[PDB]
Symmetry: D2
Subunit: 205 residues, 4 copies
């Protein structure tokens, strides 16, 4: 059967949970228009993250791959337009790496556009009453690193397969710490991802 692969990260150091993981956990094993969703959690570590990712794309041979990360501070669900060939880290990752301006993949192209039907996804979300928008930057931390890796790997190995990235905001419990920071409940998050993934599946363009 057809498989949609959805990924997320383990907690980043400080946090005790990763919301992105928590949000997709309810999707495990569910069916959408004749494809079953597989999930898989990857470490929040440069390069080691791509290894885990590649293994997952390899094992599951998915028709659609969607990675999810957390973008603390953003007000809404954001669907990434583009991944950039650059690691540049404000803080270190889970294994203590803090690369400065080094390529995700050496001699790889400057960027890859997501192949997902991004405007339709954002449109679907807005219509469902969920705030959502297209983003032009996935950042330069692990989230963008994984998005670039994904899109490159699909382009080298299985070019018909569509890949992309979705960032969720802070959970309310996390915004309590930060203080004046936007959040979204776990429940709404899980619903937003579900709507986005169905919409990604139905369409293409």
């Amino acid at each position: 059967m057809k498989t949609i692969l959805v990924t997320a990260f383990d907690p980043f150091g400080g946090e005790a949970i990763n919301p992105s993981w928590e949000a997709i956990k309810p999707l495990q094993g569910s069916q959408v228009f004749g494809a079953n969703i597989e999930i898989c959690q990857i470490p929040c570590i440069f390069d080691t993250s791509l290894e885990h990712l590649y293994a997952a794309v390899d094992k599951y041979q998915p028709e659609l791959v969607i990675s999810v990360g957390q973008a603390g501070g953003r007000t809404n669900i954001t669907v990434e337009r583009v991944a950039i060939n650059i690691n540049d880290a404000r803080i270190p990752d889970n294994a203590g790496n803090q690369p400065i301006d080094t390529p995700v993949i050496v001699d790889g192209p400057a960027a890859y556009f997501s192949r997902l039907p991004i405007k339709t996804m954002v449109n679907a979300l807005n219509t469902a009453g969920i705030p959502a928008s297209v983003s032009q930057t996935a950042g330069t931390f692990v989230c963008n690193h994984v998005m670039y890796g994904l899109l490159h790997y699909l382009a080298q190995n299985t070019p018909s397969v569509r890949g992309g990235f979705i960032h969720v905001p802070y959970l309310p419990e996390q915004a309590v710490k930060d203080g004046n920071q936007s959040s979204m409940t776990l429940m709404l998050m899980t619903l937003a991802l579900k709507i986005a993934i169905e919409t990604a599946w139905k369409n293409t363009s």
Copy 2:
């Protein structure tokens, strides 16, 4: 014993007002020894106060908490102070757009809320709900109603504590604006429950 909790009908534009939606589920529920009553008031200057005064008079509450919506805010906010000024960016549902007039002529400049605001904000934070104390309720209808409330309690029944909570946008309303913070109806309702129970308990 009675806890009166109020909200507004929608600001002309919107089809609903989140604040009314959020406290509907609270009606009838028992809090320690007290029962919650709700009552919706029109979102327009001076008439709002009349409906309010009516409700306080009918229910004779031990504790009155008014709720309104503060589009743009990221979290539940509990108000510190109400100010004796109407100054309106837009008109209310009835076309009034007062500029720099008193809420109540010869009334004091301001009233402090009587609620245990910090404790409430703590209960909410502990529960994993973003919340903070605010020093401005605005100068539109919400502040109008807040100042009016506290002045009426101060005149007619000084032992009764009053105050104000602002809720952010619902998610559906933040689609419209675009890049604006929101909070689901469910979470509001839970936050208000915790907030009210805390005020009563203290």
Copy 3:
């Protein structure tokens, strides 16, 4: 005929206070037959009111305007109301961190500024300077002082109008604080001058 303008000495961290830097050029300057007198006051609860009360007695001014810094704000803000509360998130220059205490016991809950605030915001906006009326002066030393000021004038010299103005970060200040709005000293001085002239003009007959 004297206009007293006050500002603070730098708050512990900072090496200067912009509100002070901004009003220095105004010392001795004429405005419609009045003289500007400036005075720096300590950023400490209670001691500040002492300096302030001293300066008012000394200079016997017909108009008093106090200036402070509101890191974060984008523009010039003219305060509408002073609140009778001290609530300190961090301590003052002398280690005091009062939590929910009167500025003045048994004083009224608040004081409205007696200054012509809309006309001041308008004179600023018309001269191309971003400005707006503010409904809160915070609950640190700046509001503490605004409140004491209005109280003191009300009690001793009731025809004398008082009010508070907040300036934003200087650009050098915003460098550290990363993503923060600033305004140059030059613009700040210019704004304060226009604000003060406008105040003096609409405090006549």
Copy 4:
């Protein structure tokens, strides 16, 4: 030996364009034995590229920095990457509003700026000017021009480095837009002069 520096004409609504106003004083100013040439280009898709390509052909520059307005940003921003997409919220000066079309058909997805972006941000910060690297130059005419610039340079004169700097609103402009960050004209001109000196030296 010429540094070409470009800016846009006022955008439809606006009466001036801060990007142009801030580079005017730089005309013919010398920096380390190079001379600065400025040129204003239209805020129209494609037509802008034709002007740009012509200025590069005429002036034969060793360095090319394009400047633009990013209303709302708090500081000077130095762009890191240009994106091969036109996606316009509103139309350009000539009524064009492309939705999701390539800037240049069959071009690579992006170009990195060849400027020393971190060094420029550091010199600015060191000099007390707020500034930072940006990962998106938007998808309107500014990004359009950046991409065209870097692509043109790469196909015709690959030795020559190119890049983009965004400036915030002038205070004049933030008066309208209300609660908006600004930076005075003088501080912009200063910032731009330090960035270009730094870019040339490295």
